[PDB]
Every structure is written in structure tokens, then in C-alpha cells.
Design a protein around this ligand. Structure first.
Ligand SMILES: CS(=O)(=O)N1C[C@H](O)[C@H]2C[C@@H]1CC[C@H]2O
Length: 281
């Protein structure tokens, strides 16, 4: 059982050591499309690339590239698109991907500015009456409503395909209180946030995969998907303690590199799953 494994690693202070064995065992697949010269300004970080096998393709004939990965968890029947925070020049691509994949939710785990630098473009409207048009991808986005809480904001958005005049409602879940350094002290507000996303229907199989991002789409984004998948597997299995968080992480790392960036994120993921298991048993 993970709770005992937790106390063992904690007591022994072996978090950096567990984390290194995960790094060592992690999959390495080609990422040739990401590294083409024409895609250099579509990537926020030169060392964070989607694998060719799992990358999301835009349906535009010119250049189909976006820094985004499909993570397919077969046993849990959950899919996620993990992506970087969009760049000034990829905001239109981001919304095209949301449209093309039939996503119902966007989960944002960073602030636009952290540590005095921009981590992400302002890719949604700030006021009802000031909508955004993306000329490159022929989409219009309107803020319908905004519910600001202590730890997170939920926004209702309308996305319109200007080409066909179809509209969809998108939910934007913005976790606003992840600290600039390290991880939250308690997983309570993170779990509350994750149950809010679940309750919305955004993670359900009747929609396209949820789009999850932080700045790189690997650290905080990683923790989100890992916690959701582990809790779902504990509901589904005859024996809940058969769920090994290290094995789940390694399976997720076949689809996108670097998921969980620090030993502290790993520790936090264990704590989130262990605490969430109480609200599920
Ligand atoms: C020494 S350790 O690897 O067990 N250790 C745990 C501690 O909480 C600090 C610093 C370091 C790794 C991450 C961070 O959580």
C-alpha cells in the first residue's frame, strides 16, 4: 500500500532517489516533427517536445504542428491532451485544436505571470463585451460568465467556428493559487479543483479529451492527470491497493516526456492520491 511506501520514502528521505529511477526508466521516442526548423517558434521550450507517435495534428494543410500530446489511459478509459501554455503566435492554433478535438474543458494550472516573467499568452477574453477573433484559424471566442473563488476561477466561454457558424460552450478551469516555488502545503484545494472538473462532465467519454496546460505542459499538468487516473483506477479495481503510482506515471510518460518535473511534485502526487482515496473509500 502507497500510504506505507509514502512513510518509508519520507522517513528515509529517498524522494530524489525514487524520482531518478523514474527518469532512468522513462520512455524515449522520436520527436522529429517538433525539431523541424519551421516549428521552432511553435515551441515555448526547446527541451520540451511532443513524441511524433502521440502528437496532436491540426487539420490545416499548411503546417499541422502544435506542441500537444494525447495521453490515452486504456484501463481507466480516460484521455487527456497535455499542451504548453500558448504563445502569442499559437493562440489561434490552441483554439483550433480545442475545436477539432471536441474538448469540453480547458484546465489551466499557472498564472499568466509568475516570477515576474510571462508563462503564457492571455488566450481568453477578460470582459463579456470584448470578444477575441483569431483571423488565422477563423474562430471567435466570447466570455459568457466568470465565477471567481478563493483557489480557482471557472469561466464559461462560447467558441464559434466563423466558417460554419456552429458554436460550442467551453469551460475554463483556472487553478490560481499554485505557489511560484514548490507545491501547495495541503492537497485539499487541488482535490476540490479536480472534483469540480469531474463534476462538470469535461473528463467524460461523451466529449473529446480535456485540454490541460501549465507553462511547459509536463509538471503541474502531470500531477493533475496522474492524480485523476490513479483515483479512477482505485474505484475500478477489485483490489484498490494494486494501484502503483510509479507504474501509472511510467505508462503516462510513454505519451509525453517529463511528466512530473521535481521530486516535490512526485511527493505531492502521492499525498493527493492518498488524501483523495479517503473521499473515495
Ligand atoms: C531529501 S528528499 O529527496 O526526501 N527531499 C524531500 C523533501 O520534502 C524536499 C527536498 C527533497 C526532495 C523534495 C522536497 O520535497
Amino acid at each position: 500500500e502507497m500510504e506505507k511506501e509514502f512513510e518509508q520514502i519520507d522517513k528515509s528521505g529517498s524522494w530524489a532517489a525514487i524520482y531518478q529511477d523514474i527518469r532512468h526508466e522513462a520512455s524515449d521516442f522520436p520527436s522529429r516533427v517538433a525539431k523541424l526548423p519551421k516549428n521552432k517558434n511553435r515551441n515555448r521550450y526547446r527541451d520540451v517536445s511532443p513524441f511524433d507517435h502521440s502528437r496532436i495534428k491540426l487539420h490545416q494543410e499548411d503546417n499541422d504542428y502544435i506542441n500537444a500530446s494525447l495521453i490515452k489511459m486504456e484501463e481507466a478509459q480516460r484521455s487527456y491532451i497535455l499542451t504548453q501554455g500558448p504563445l502569442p503566435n499559437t493562440v489561434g492554433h490552441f483554439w483550433e485544436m480545442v475545436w477539432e478535438q471536441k474538448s469540453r474543458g480547458v484546465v489551466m494550472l499557472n498564472r499568466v505571470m509568475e516570477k515576474g516573467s510571462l508563462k503564457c499568452a492571455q488566450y481568453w477574453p477578460q470582459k463579456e463585451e470584448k470578444e477575441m477573433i483569431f483571423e488565422d484559424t477563423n474562430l471567435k471566442l466570447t466570455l459568457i460568465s466568470e465565477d471567481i473563488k478563493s483557489y480557482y476561477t471557472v469561466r464559461q466561454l462560447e467558441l464559434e467556428n466563423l466558417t460554419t457558424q456552429e458554436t460550442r460552450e467551453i469551460l475554463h478551469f483556472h487553478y490560481t493559487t499554485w505557489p511560484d516555488f514548490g507545491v501547495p502545503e495541503s492537497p485539499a484545494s487541488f482535490l476540490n479543483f479536480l472534483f469540480k472538473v469531474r463534476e462538470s462532465g469535461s473528463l467524460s467519454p461523451e466529449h473529446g479529451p480535456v485540454v490541460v496546460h501549465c507553462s511547459a505542459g509536463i509538471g503541474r499538468s502531470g500531477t493533475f492527470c496522474l492524480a485523476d487516473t490513479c483515483l479512477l483506477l482505485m474505484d475500478k479495481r477489485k483490489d484498490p491497493s494494486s494501484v502503483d503510482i510509479k507504474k501509472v506515471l511510467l505508462e503516462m510518460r510513454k505519451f509525453r516526456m517529463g511528466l512530473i518535473q521535481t521530486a516535490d511534485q512526485l511527493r505531492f502526487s502521492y499525498l493527493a492520491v492518498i488524501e483523495g482515496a479517503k473521499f473515495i473509500m
